[PDB]
Symmetry: D2
Subunit: 171 residues, 4 copies
């Protein structure tokens, strides 16, 4: 059963946030580990990242935030709406005011790529509240700007300008 | 250049935290979607999670926290030590005092399964600054509690008693 | 009109928190300043603390949480209930587990003296929704572990045992 | 002895923040209460606010953040520098971007009056490390924009435009 007392709820939320941070950091370290002359350290990094994922999933289930697929899609829709309507524009404008190139560039990349996720989730929710699965194949993702390309893949990136060969395929 | 202003650094740290949380949530959503008759929505969730990973990696690179393997290995060691020694016993004590079965069980699993990551990382560091690669193969991870079993794997999980075949191998 | 946007609401809440912390810090600084040989620096600290109070009051008015007293007492009642019931026992248990004399002593002084505020506020609210002011006089307070003594004053503080002459009277 | 373990430090810092918030809220409620037909409610509000101040002071001393006046003034100097350089300009620009009148007005009042506090603290500090007290009298504070006037007080407020009769005297 979901926890009700406030303090244990706060503690579990903080634990989930920490475990997610740890898993993401380990994933980031693994890429550089495999990019250097130590191919077998990325194995350990990915295994322990999976362990942190398991811990975070256990914490998430403990709070009882998981339901059916339509509710998960609704939560994703709300999260995506908050990430490209309120947070990122303000962060980009603050970074412009303070005058630093890297933060402005990163938020520029992240600001223009999040507008599609909400549409995809809404389509999935409209097609999932009845008993049927959507049709999709060979989703392309950029490794430099995170740009969701569905089915067809543009020859060059309309955000950074990377060639189509550089993309990663999820099928 | 690395971000030196305080407000932009705080903004980017919060954005990194949000992206990591979103990526973890999307991975959990995909895991749930595989369990129902929607194999394609799991693909969509995985692709969007990889996009969130790219966003968070760009945010992490902007802050300049990434370097060579010894430094991020030491960072992982510090994080694991902090997680095992201080936070988890306190959370377990608080959950025991308030009296939630789920929080106590999850914290018990976490504090009993997280003890080996620090030792593994500590050993690995003193070989990744001289120039060689670690000799570890075929790592095992439990899918319920998450206990890193290196090379050989026990017949049953000492923490939860899961069968051997349930283990997720990495090689 | 009240502030409706989420991001700027969060910004104003954080600013209010910072102003309150600064005002508390200045009020604490003034007491030590007057304890030494500088009676004018205490005056400067008091004036600057009042300026911070004005800032925080403006921030509070902007967010729109201040209104008529009959409904205003409810926020204080809820805050006192949360402080006495949930937050403080957990902190006391954690400080006992980690083993710090100062934290345990401070929490023990805290939870045992915060119990009367909720009762006083409930009585004030249920006597003050008809247009009449409550009949109360000479509220006493201990200067070490403040225990809200109403009207009459005990000879010694039941919590710390301080003499009666040290009580700070309000009239 | 100062608290050294991390979790107790976090808990005590959160408690201090909560107590400061409670004190400020109670002060504002008292000021509203005395503005209407109930005079004696403000007495109770101010008494319990003093109790919250005592609790916050105990928590602050527990973390051992208090020293002599020379070093005490440094914390105020740094706080004012951060408040007037980083936080308020960014908050004002964000409020301008989102387009709300109240937040822009409050931040405009706040950012134009905090520049003199750092100078006052520095002037007090240079005279404090030698062993003597500064000379100051009749400090005026505006009650609708927080504006520190030293000795002489202008006829009209150069920020809001209030007459010099409305000010409050801190002697
Ligand atoms: Fe963990
Ligand atoms: Fe996103
Ligand atoms: Fe791209
Ligand atoms: Fe297990
Ligand atoms: Fe301020
Ligand atoms: Fe209280
Ligand atoms: Fe007492
Ligand atoms: Fe209180
Ligand atoms: Fe200030
Ligand atoms: Fe003014």
């Amino acid at each position: 059963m979901v926890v009700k007392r406030t303090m244990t709820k706060k503690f579990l939320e903080e634990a989930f946030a920490g475990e997610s941070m740890a898993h993401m950091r380990y994933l980031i370290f693994a890429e550089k580990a495999e990019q250097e002359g130590f191919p077998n350290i990325a194995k350990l990094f990915r295994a322990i990242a999976y362990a942190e994922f398991v811990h975070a999933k256990n914490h998430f289930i403990a709070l009882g935030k998981l339901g059916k697929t339509p509710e998960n899609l609704q939560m994703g829709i709300e999260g995506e709406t908050f990430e490209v309507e309120e947070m990122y524009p303000v962060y980009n404008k603050a970074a412009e005011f303070q005058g630093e190139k890297e933060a402005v560039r990163t938020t520029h990349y992240a600001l223009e790529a999040e507008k599609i996720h909400a549409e995809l989730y809404r389509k999935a929710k409209e097609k999932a509240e009845k008993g049927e699965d959507i049709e999709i194949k060979k989703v392309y993702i950029c490794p430099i700007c995170g740009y969701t390309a569905v089915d067809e893949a543009p020859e060059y990136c309309p955000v950074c300008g990377a060639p189509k060969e550089k993309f990663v395929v999820f099928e």
